[model samples]
Each structure stands twice: as structure tokens, then as C-alpha cells.
Target: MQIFVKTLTGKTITLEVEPSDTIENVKAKIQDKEGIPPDQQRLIFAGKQLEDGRTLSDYNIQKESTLHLVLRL
Candidate 1:
């Protein structure tokens, strides 16, 4: 599935992800594409924070789902 990630500064990143991919995996992808460290990336979807160990399927994220990315200091 493809998903959209919106950054705090309003940049949108398109990612091709699978249901079995963990949140950490997504963060790693973001790190590769955007140069943002996974340790500093916080992903939120449907108003809930996604945990590193949890898969996209665990949250029932659908295709074209938009996730918010909040950077941690």
C-alpha cells in the first residue's frame, strides 16, 4: 500500500509500504528518503502515535492513508 506522510513543515512524502512493515521500518525509509533520523521521528495516524514494533496492519492503516510526522528534539 502507498501512504502519505506530512511533515511538521508541511512537506508531504509518498511512501510505498506493506501491511507487514513495522513503524520502525517506515521510519528507516523516511531516514533514507528525507535524511531524518528514526530516533527523532514520531509518526502519528488517526490521532494515535505509532509504536516502533507495531506493523501498519496492526493499526489497520489503509491505502492512501495520511500520517503526520512530528520531529523530536
Candidate 2:
């Protein structure tokens, strides 16, 4: 599945992920691609904070699902 990500700054990226992919791993990808620190990232999806301990499938984040990102200053 594909996951879409949008930063508070309006930058965007897409991640090709599996059902087993962890939210923490997605944050790592954001850090690598968007230059945002993983520790500084807060991902929100479906109006809730996406927890690092869960899998993408656990959150029901399907292909093309967009996640909003907030970066710590």
C-alpha cells in the first residue's frame, strides 16, 4: 500500500509500505526524505496521533491515506 504524508510546512511525500510497517519506521522515512528529525515528528491520521507501537494495518491506513505531520521546533 501507499501512504501519503504532509508536513505542517506543506511539504509532502509518499511512502510505499506494507501492512506490517510500523509508524516509527514511517517517521524514519520522513526524517530521511524530508530532513525532519524522527524524534521531532508527530504524525496524525484520522484525527488521532498515530502511535509508534502500531502497524499501518492496525491503524487501518490504506493506500493513498494521508497523514498530517507536525515537527517540533
Candidate 3:
């Protein structure tokens, strides 16, 4: 599935992953693509934080779903 990740500064990136991929995996990809540390990334969808251990399927994330990235200070 392809997910649209939006950064706090209004930047957006398209990420490809399987339904089984965890949010942690997504964060790692975000770290590589956006230079933000996974530890500092808070991914939000549907107004809720996406937990690390949970799979994307758990949240019923559809293809091209929108996710927001909030970086920690």
C-alpha cells in the first residue's frame, strides 16, 4: 500500500509498505527519506498517534491514506 505522509512543515512524501508493516517500520523509512529520527517521529492518523508495534492493517489504513508526521523537540 502507498501512504501519504505529511510533515509538520507541510512537506509530503509517498511511502510504500505492506499491510503487515508496523508503524515503526514506517518511521524507519521516514527517517531515511526525511532525515528525521524515528525516535523523534510521531505519526498521526485519524487524530490518533500510530503506535510503533501495531501493524498498519490494525488501523485499517487504506491505500494512499494520509498520515501526519510530528517531530519531537
Candidate 4:
């Protein structure tokens, strides 16, 4: 499965992962790609902070799902 990640920088990226990939994992991936530190990473899902061990599939984020990251101005 692939997830479409959009950063506050306006960069959109595609990443392929298994169904078991969690939001935390995705955040880590984003940190890796954007050089954002793990502690500085925050993932808001459905307007709430995504808990650890919570998979993207748990939120029903299918292929081509677009996720946005808010960057500090």
C-alpha cells in the first residue's frame, strides 16, 4: 500500500508500506525525509494526535490517501 504525504513545505511524496504501518512510523518516515526530529513530529489524524502503535489501516487510510504535515512558520 502507498500513502501520499504532503508537507507544509508543499512537497508531496509517495511511500509504499505494509498494512501494519502506523502513524508513528509514517511520522518517522517524514522526519527522515524532511529532517524533522522525532520529538518535533506531530501527526494529527481526524483532528486528534495519533497514538503510538496505531496503524494507518486502523484509521482506514487507503492507498492514495493524502496526509498533511503542519510545519512551524
Candidate 5:
């Protein structure tokens, strides 16, 4: 299964990877797609912390799913 991630930079990219991947891995993929460093990556989904260690199973995301990353600041 593949996952689609929209970076904080407002850029969208799809990777042929599994959603079961760790939040850390997802974070790195988003960084690569959006050019945003993992440290700079601040996203929240479903009122929960959004990171690479997070998997779609964690939030039950769908194909072409759009996850809104709410920032603290």
C-alpha cells in the first residue's frame, strides 16, 4: 500500500510505501517530499501528534488522504 503526504510547505507527494511504516519513517518521507527537516516538521492529525512513527493504521487514513497538521505555534 502507498501513502500520500502533504507537507507543511503545502506540497503534496505520494510514495509507494506502506502506511504501516513507523512515524519516524513517514516523517522522513514528508521531509524529503517537502524539503522540511524532521526537526522542523510539526504536524498534528486527529488531535494527536503527527510524526514519522505514525502509521495510517494509527489514524485509519485512506488513499489520497489529506491529513491536516495543526501546528503548536
Candidate 6:
């Protein structure tokens, strides 16, 4: 499945993921593409924050879902 990560700065990142992939794993992929550390990345979907240990399936994330990315300072 594919998902979108939209940053506050107006940057949008597209990622290909599996339902078994953890939120932490998604962050790692973002880090690879944008150089942002996983620890500093927070992902939100459906108005709730995504936990690092949780899988995309845990959130019932569908293909092409858009996740908001909030970066920690």
C-alpha cells in the first residue's frame, strides 16, 4: 500500500508500505527520503497520533491515506 506524509512546511512525501510495517518503520523511510530523525517525527492519522510500535493495519490505514507529519524541535 501507499501513503502520504505531509509536513507543516508544505512538503509531501510518498511512501510505499506494508500493512505489517510499524509506524517507526514509516519514520525510518521518511528519514531516508528527507533526513529527518525518527525520534523527531510524529505521524497523525484520522486526528490521532500514531504510535511507533503500531502497524498501519492497527490504524486501518488504506491505500493512498494521507498522514500528517509533525516534527519535533
**In terms of TM-score, how similar is model 1 to the real structure?**
0.96
Candidate 4 lDDT over 1-73, as tens digits, reads 8877676678887877677887778878887677877666566655666666799888777777777766543
**On TM-score, who's better, 2 or 6?**
6
Q: For residues 1-73, write the lDDT of model 6, one tens digit per residue.
A: 8899999888888999888998888999989988988899999898998989989999999999999999888
How accurate locally, in lDDT, is each candidate?
0.94, 0.85, 0.91, 0.72, 0.62, 0.91
Looking at model 3, the pairs that clash are: none
lDDT of 6 at 47: 93
> Stretches of candidate 1 above 4 Å error?
none
Choose the strongest candidate by lDDT: 1
The lDDT, on a scale of 0 to 1, for candidate 6 is: 0.91
Task: Kindly list the per-residue Cα lDDT of model 3 for residues 1-73, writing each as its tens digit.
Answer: 8999998799889998788898899999898888998799999999999988999999999999989999898
Better of 1 and 6 by TM-score: 1
27 in model 4: Cα distance from truth in Å? 1.5
Residue pairs with colliding backbones in model 5 are 22-52, 22-53, 23-52, 23-53, 23-54, 24-52, 24-53, 27-52
Cα TM-score per model? 0.96, 0.90, 0.95, 0.75, 0.62, 0.94
Identify the superior model by TM-score, candidate 1 or candidate 2: 1
Error of 5 at 22 (Å): 1.7
After TM-score superposition, what is the CA distance of residue 49 in candidate 2 from its true location, in Å?
0.7
lDDT of 1 by residue, 1-73 (tens): 8999999899999999998999999999899989988899999999999999999999999999999999999
Q: Which segments of model 2 are wrong by more than 4 Å?
A: none
Best by TM-score: 1
The per-residue C-alpha lDDT of model 3 at residue 3 equals 91
